[PDB]
Design a protein around this ligand. Sequence first.
Ligand SMILES: */C(=C/C(=O)N(C)c1cc2c(cc1F)nc(Nc1ccccc1C)c1cncn12)CN(C)C
Length: 263
Amino acid sequence: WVIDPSELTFVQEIGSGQFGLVHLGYWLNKDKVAIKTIREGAMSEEDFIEEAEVMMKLSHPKLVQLYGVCLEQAPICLVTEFMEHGCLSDYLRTQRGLFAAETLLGMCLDVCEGMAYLEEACVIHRDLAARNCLVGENQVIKVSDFGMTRFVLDDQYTSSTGTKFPVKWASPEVFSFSRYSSKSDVWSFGVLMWEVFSEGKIPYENRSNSEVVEDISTGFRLYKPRLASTHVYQIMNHCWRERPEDRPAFSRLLRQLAEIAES
Ligand SMILES: */C(=C/C(=O)N(C)c1cc2c(cc1F)nc(Nc1ccccc1C)c1cncn12)CN(C)C
């Protein structure tokens, strides 16, 4: 799982993601790859390195595949499969008005399938959102960055009371207690479905973190996107049930959403 620096070449910078810059490149005797160069100070590197081998064993057609880590020299690099079309969030926003509702549902299903695999593996994403899903060939969506907030060194992001905490995607037991589970990922998935059917609109736009907490705690929920059917919106609302035990598992979501899609 360790990749030597001599085994990588960097071709072009493609953009910036969690923890630092990403390049298109090649990996010796292997493939074309994406390579993320971890910025100094952003990541708990030793903690991540301990987990990297087990993260690589996670492998599913709808999850971004970790291929290895280049760690001989600072800064360290993570290497993955290459996805051509960037973040799902940007992809929806830049092409707003073009997508059929069926295509939007299909994106949610791809995400749901990857999350079902994580659920079965007992791996919690912790920060699932359109902004960390990537878009590949034929508009396949793959889930990325699962578990990575365990290594983010910015306390304002990782603490529930932090000024940058991703409260818009957090279930009440996460925003209250940092009680993460696959059922808190299910809540996040409901907000992501909202993002997709809204073609990358910002959820709770111009609500402060404290306002989102208050709204959710007093029963407010995101409005139905025009492109979401009443049935799809019912499923979204299932993901935002207050009690995690009342939210469907991803395995159940996947069945429900498939039946809607295939009929
Ligand atoms: C989101 C996407 C984006 O615009 N780009 C260019 C992008 C592509 C990309 C990224 C990160 C990006 F910012 N990361 C990986 N793979 C990856 C994932 C996790 C850890 C390491 C690695 C290498 C990847 C694979 N194909 C394409 N990418 C940017 N937002 C607007 C912030």
